[PDB]
Design a protein around this nucleic acid. Structure first.
Ligand SMILES: [Mg+2]
Ligand SMILES: [Mg+2]
Ligand SMILES: [Mg+2]
Ligand SMILES: [Mg+2]
Ligand SMILES: [Zn+2]
Lengths: 98, 122, 147, 38, 148, 216, 130
RNA sequence: CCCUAAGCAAUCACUUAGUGGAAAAGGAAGUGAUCGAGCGAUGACAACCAGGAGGUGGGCUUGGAAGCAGCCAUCCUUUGA
C-alpha cells in the first residue's frame, strides 16, 4: 500500500506525458525530435492525469523523491516564460526579456 | 487553510480552564483569510455549563467525520492533522476521477529488490 | 462588511464644485470607480457649507463599485496657515520662521477638529498637542501670547 | 557562480554551506549571489 | 604636512641609514591623547606616506558619506603618525657600488602599541566602520581603541 | 563633616566587589612571568607615611579574571577614582585572612598590544588620609544646548581633572551641565561643582570645553 | 518596564472597581475598538484595557478578585468598571452588539462578589435596576 | 611498528586535516577549555495565527512625490502596538 506521494506539473505548448506499461514506464514529449523514456524503479509507480500532471506514487520515500527530481531534471523551468516541468507548489519567478 | 472542510462543530465549557486550544482554533477558523476561502463552509459554536469536555468534531467534503482531542492537543496540531488527512482525501479524489482504482497497491517486496539509477533515454 | 476591500484613496475637493473631470478624472478612473453617484452624494451634503473650501474626502474603493465614505474636515495645514497668514512653508522648518500663533487659534482649531467622525473621544489636550506637532513641521513659531 | 577567496553574505537570503569540504554561499532570491571559496 | 602627502620640507641630511624596525614596544601602555576613538597598531613595522594618506582619505570619505549637512565636518581626525625617513633606490641595469642611490619616498617607523589615528565627533558605529575601512590600506595589524 | 553632600553622585553598589589576593615572595620578571602564566596579576600594597624605606609594602597577586572584569565594566579611568576592599589571605580557599584594608588602585598597567593586565598598584587609604586623585568628567545636557542645536561642534579639551581628595568623599565622576552654553563660550576648571573640602591642583583658569562655531 | 506599566494600569483601575469582565476581540479593528472604548467611557463610568493574561494573573494575586483564574484564556480585552450601575454598564454592550451586528465578540466571564457567573447567568442581573 | 640496534612503552588531555609532512593579507565558523553579559517560567528564542493606526497627503521641491528621487523637521495622541 502506497504512502509517499509527489506531484509534477508540465507547462508548455505541445509538451506531453504518458504512462505506458501498468504505471512502470514513463514517456515524455518535450519539444525534441524524439521522445524521452524513463523506467520507473521498483517500489514506485507513476500516473498521468488530464491537467498535464504526473504523479509519482510509492512506498519508499527516498526512491519516490529521487525519481520525482529525476523526472524534473529532464527539463527545468526556464526563467523567461516558465516553460518546462516543475513542482505543483513550486513558484517560478520570471523576468522580462529585452 | 479553509478549503477542505464543510462543517466544523466546536463545543466547550466556558468556566473550565482547558479551553485555550479550542478558542485558539476558533481564532484560526474565524479569520478574515479563512471565511473568504470557503463561503459555503459552516461553523457551529456550542457552549454549555455542564462537564462535557471540549471537543472539535469536523466533517469533510466526502462524508468523512473526524473527532479530535481538543482538551490535550493544541489547535496548531489540529490544523496540521486536518490538512494531513485532507491532502490524502484530495489525492484519492483526483485518482478516482481519472479512472484509477483506490487505494493503489504495490507489492511490499520490492523494498528488498535492488534498483539501478534512472538515466533518461531517447 | 464581507466585501474584499481593494484600496482606500483620499482626495481634496472644493466645496460645491463637484464637477467630475478636473480632480475626479484619472484619480478615480485609475481604480475603475464611478463618477456620477459619488458626486451626487457629495453635492447632497455640502449645501450648508461655505464654497471654495478644500474639503477632505476619503473613499474606500471596492470590486463591486460601492462607495462607503466619510467626510473629513479641511486639512490642519490649511487651518493653521489660513488663520495665520501667507500659505508658503519654510525652506528649512524648525529654524526658519514664517508666522506666529500663540494659544488661541490652535485651541479652537482643535475644537473644530473634534468634529471628525472618528474623533468623538480624543481629548482636547491630545488634539492641541497634535496640532502643535504639525505647527513645528512647517516652520511657524508658537509663543505664550503674541503682543 | 562567482569564485573568489573571500565569500560574504550580500543580503538576507544568503546561506553558507560546507559542501564536500568547500565553502559555498547559496542564495534563494538573487542567483547572482552564488559564490564559491577558491 | 604639505597638504595631503606628508613629509618634511627639508632635512639635515639627504640620506639616512636603514636602521631596524622589527622590534620596539610602548613600555608603559598607550592611551588616547586627543580623541574618543582611535586606531592603534598591534605589530611593529614600516608604513609609507602614501598608505597613511590613503587611510586618512578613507576615513574622511566615510564620514563624508555617513554624515552630511552641518555635522559633515563635526567628525575630527588626528593623524599621530608622521613619515620622516627617506628611503633610497638604484634603478635597473646598474652595478653594485658607485655610492648611494637617489631618494624615492618616505616611510614611518611604527612600534607595537603606537596610535596611528584618532577620531572624535562621530558615532561609535561610524568610528568602528571607518577603522575597519582604514585598516585595509595598511600592511600592519591594527586594533580599534576606545577611551575609558 | 566627612560625608557626601546631597545632590552629589556616590559609588555604585553593583561594582562594590572585594579583591582577593595571596602573598608573593619575590620581585622580578621571572616570578612575574610565572604568576602571569599561572593566571594571576602581580601587585603591591603600600602606604604613604614612609616613602623611603619601602613604605610597609606587601607583595601580593590578584586574579586576572576579576581584575579584567572590573576594568572592562568600569572603564580605565573610573576604576582609578574609586576605593575598594582588599582581602589578603594565605591561600585561595583558606580562611587565614592576613589583611583586610580599604585601598585605592593607584595605577594599573595594561599591555600596549594585547591589553592584558600586567601590574596593579594599591595604596592604603583609611579615613583621614589625603590623595591626589584624577577624576573623570561626564558631559550631560548636550541635547539642550542652544549652541549644539545651531549646528556647532563640541571641543572637549580635557577629560580628567586632578584633585587633592580626602579618602572618604572621593567623587566617582563629575557631572558637567551643558544646558546653557551657546556658540563661543567655554567652561574653565573653576566651574566644577565639587565638595568644598576638595582642593584643585591645577589653576582655575584652565579651559575644559569650548563650543566653537561651525563652517558656514 | 511594561510589567510596571500594566501593574500601574490595573492598580489605578482597581481603586473603585466592583466587577470585571473580559471580551473576545476577534475580528474587531482599531477604530471599532476605539468606538467601544468611547461608548463605554463617556456613556458609562468604565474603562477598557488589553493586557497580558499572566500579568493580570500575577497582579490580581492577594486580592478578592482571585476567583477569576479559569477565565483568562485566548483573546481577552479586560473591562474594569469603577461604578455600580450594572444595568447601564451591561446594556451598552447590547446596544453596541445590535447596532454594529457583531456576534463574534461576546462577554466571556465576569466576577461579582467572589463568584463567576455564566454568560447566561449575568443576563438577568442587568434587568434588576437599583 | 618494519626498513634499522633498541618500547604496537605507562598516565591525563587534544586533531580526523594524511594536519603532522612547505607559503601571507583575507574569508568561513568545525571542535574543545574558561571569564562575563542580555533575555527567562512575570513564559524567552524557533514556529503558527491576527493587528501593525490617527493629525497626515508634515512642509519645501514639484509634470509627480503621499513613509520610501532630493532638503528640512522627525513632533503629538488613542493605545497592547
Ligand atoms: Mg630584581
Ligand atoms: Mg629491530
Ligand atoms: Mg603536508
Ligand atoms: Mg597554513
Ligand atoms: Zn543573496
Amino acid at each position: 500500500e502506497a504512502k509517499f506521494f509527489r506531484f509534477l506539473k508540465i507547462v508548455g505548448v505541445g509538451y506531453k506525458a504518458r504512462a505506458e506499461e501498468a504505471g512502470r514506464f514513463l514517456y515524455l514529449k518535450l519539444g525534441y525530435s524524439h521522445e524521452v523514456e524513463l523506467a520507473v524503479p521498483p517500489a514506485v509507480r507513476v500516473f498521468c492525469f488530464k491537467n498535464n500532471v504526473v504523479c509519482c506514487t510509492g512506498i519508499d520515500k527516498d526512491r519516490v523523491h529521487q525519481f520525482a527530481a529525476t523526472v524534473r531534471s529532464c527539463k527545468p523551468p526556464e526563467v523567461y516564460k516558465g516553460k518546462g516541468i516543475m513542482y505543483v507548489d513550486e513558484v517560478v519567478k520570471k523576468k522580462v526579456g529585452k | 487553510m479553509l478549503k477542505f472542510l464543510s462543517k466544523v462543530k466546536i463545543e466547550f465549557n466556558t468556566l473550565d480552564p482547558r479551553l485555550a486550544s479550542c478558542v485558539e482554533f476558533l481564532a484560526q477558523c474565524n479569520a478574515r483569510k479563512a471565511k473568504e476561502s470557503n463561503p459555503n463552509c459552516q461553523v457551529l459554536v456550542k457552549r454549555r455549563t455542564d462537564d462535557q469536555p471540549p471537543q472539535i468534531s469536523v466533517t469533510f467534503v466526502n462524508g468523512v467525520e473526524e473527532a479530535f482531542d481538543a482538551a490535550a492537543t493544541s489547535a496548531q496540531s489540529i490544523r496540521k492533522m486536518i490538512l494531513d488527512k485532507g491532502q490524502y482525501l484530495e489525492t484519492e479524489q483526483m485518482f478516482r476521477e481519472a479512472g484509477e482504482q483506490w487505494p493503489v497497491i504495490i507489492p511490499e517486496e520490492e523494498i528488498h529488490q535492488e534498483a539501478p539509477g534512472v538515466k533518461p533515454r531517447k | 462588511t464581507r466585501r474584499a476591500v481593494a484600496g482606500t484613496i483620499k482626495l481634496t475637493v472644493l466645496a460645491g464644485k463637484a464637477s467630475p473631470g478636473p480632480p475626479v478624472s484619472p484619480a478615480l478612473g485609475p481604480y475603475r470607480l464611478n463618477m456620477m453617484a459619488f458626486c451626487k452624494d457629495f453635492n447632497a451634503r455640502t449645501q450648508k457649507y461655505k464654497p471654495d473650501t478644500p474639503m477632505a474626502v476619503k473613499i474606500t474603493a471596492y470590486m463591486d463599485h460601492s462607495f462607503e465614505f466619510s467626510v473629513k474636515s479641511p486639512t490642519v495645514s490649511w487651518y493653521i496657515k489660513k488663520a495665520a497668514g501667507v500659505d508658503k512653508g519654510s525652506t528649512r522648518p524648525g529654524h526658519l520662521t514664517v508666522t506666529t500663533l500663540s494659544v488661541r487659534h490652535v485651541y479652537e482649531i482643535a475644537k473644530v477638529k473634534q468634529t471628525d467622525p472618528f474623533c468623538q473621544y480624543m481629548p482636547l489636550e491630545s488634539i492641541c498637542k497634535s496640532i502643535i506637532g504639525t505647527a513645528n513641521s512647517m516652520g511657524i513659531k508658537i509663543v505664550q501670547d503674541l503682543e | 557562480m562567482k569564485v573568489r577567496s573571500s565569500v560574504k553574505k550580500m543580503c538576507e537570503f544568503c546561506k553558507t554551506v560546507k559542501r564536500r569540504g568547500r565553502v559555498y554561499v547559496i542564495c534563494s532570491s538573487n542567483p547572482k549571489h552564488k559564490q564559491r571559496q577558491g | 604636512k604639505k597638504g595631503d602627502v606628508l613629509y618634511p620640507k627639508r632635512t639635515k641630511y639627504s640620506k639616512y641609514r636603514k636602521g631596524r624596525c622589527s622590534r620596539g614596544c610602548k613600555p608603559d601602555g598607550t592611551k588616547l591623547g586627543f580623541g574618543r576613538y582611535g586606531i592603534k597598531s598591534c605589530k611593529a613595522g614600516r608604513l609609507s606616506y602614501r598608505a597613511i594618506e590613503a587611510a586618512r582619505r578613507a576615513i574622511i570619505g566615510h564620514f563624508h558619506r555617513a554624515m552630511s549637512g552641518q555635522f559633515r565636518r563635526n567628525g575630527k581626525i588626528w593623524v599621530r603618525v608622521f613619515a620622516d625617513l627617506p628611503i633610497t633606490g638604484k634603478p635597473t641595469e646598474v652595478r653594485m657600488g658607485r655610492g648611494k642611490g637617489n631618494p624615492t619616498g618616505w616611510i614611518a617607523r611604527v612600534s607595537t602599541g603606537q596610535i596611528l589615528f584618532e577620531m572624535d565627533g562621530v558615532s561609535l558605529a561610524n568610528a568602528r566602520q571607518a577603522a575597519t575601512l582604514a585598516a585595509h590600506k595598511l600592511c600592519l595589524s591594527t586594533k580599534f581603541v576606545q577611551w575609558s | 563633616q566627612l560625608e557626601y553632600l546631597p545632590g552629589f553622585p556616590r559609588p555604585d553598589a553593583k561594582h562594590a566587589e572585594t579583591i582577593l589576593a595571596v602573598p608573593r615572595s619575590d620581585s622580578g620578571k621571572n616570578i612575574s612571568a610565572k604568576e602571569r602564566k599561572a593566571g594571576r596579576v602581580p601587585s603591591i600594597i603600600f602606604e604613604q607615611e614612609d616613602g623611603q624605606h619601602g613604605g610597609n609594602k606587601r607583595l601580593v597577586s590578584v586574579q586576572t579574571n576579576q581584575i579584567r572584569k572590573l576594568v572592562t565594566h568600569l572603564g580605565y579611568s573610573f576604576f582609578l577614582s574609586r576605593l575598594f576592599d582588599v582581602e589578603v589571605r594565605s591561600e585561595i580557599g583558606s580562611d587565614e585572612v592576613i589583611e583586610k584594608v580599604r585601598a585605592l588602585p593607584r595605577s594599573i598597567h595594561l599591555h600596549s598590544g594585547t591589553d592584558a593586565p600586567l601590574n596593579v598598584t594599591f595604596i592604603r587609604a583609611p579615613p583621614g588620609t589625603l590623595l591626589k586623585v584624577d577624576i573623570p568628567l561626564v558631559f550631560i545636557g548636550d541635547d539642550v544646548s542652544p549652541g549644539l542645536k545651531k549646528g556647532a561642534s563640541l571641543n572637549t579639551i580635557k577629560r580628567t581633572v586632578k584633585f587633592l581628595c580626602p579618602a572618604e568623599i572621593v567623587p566617582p565622576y563629575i557631572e558637567v551641565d551643558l544646558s546653557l552654553l551657546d556658540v563661543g563660550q567655554k567652561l574653565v576648571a573653576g566651574d566644577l561643582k565639587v565638595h568644598p573640602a576638595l582642593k584643585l591642583i591645577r589653576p582655575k583658569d584652565e579651559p575644559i570645553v569650548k563650543i566653537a562655531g561651525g563652517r558656514v | 518596564r511594561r510589567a510596571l506599566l500594566v501593574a500601574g494600569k490595573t492598580k489605578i483601575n482597581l481603586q473603585n472597581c466592583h466587577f470585571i469582565t473580559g471580551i473576545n476581540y476577534n475580528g474587531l479593528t482599531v477604530k471599532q475598538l476605539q468606538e467601544l472604548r468611547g461608548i463605554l467611557r463617556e456613556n458609562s463610568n468604565t474603562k477598557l484595557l488589553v493586557a497580558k493574561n499572566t500579568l493580570v494573573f500575577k497582579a490580581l494575586e492577594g486580592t478578592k478578585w482571585e476567583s477569576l483564574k479559569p477565565c483568562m484564556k485566548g483573546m481577552n480585552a479586560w473591562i474594569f468598571v469603577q461604578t455600580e450601575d450594572i444595568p447601564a454598564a451591561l446594556k451598552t454592550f447590547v446596544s453596541f452588539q445590535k447596532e454594529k451586528k457583531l456576534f463574534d465578540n461576546n462577554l466571556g466571564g465576569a466576577v461579582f462578589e467572589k463568584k463567576l457567573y455564566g454568560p447566561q447567568d449575568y443576563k438577568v442581573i442587568e434587568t434588576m435596576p437599583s
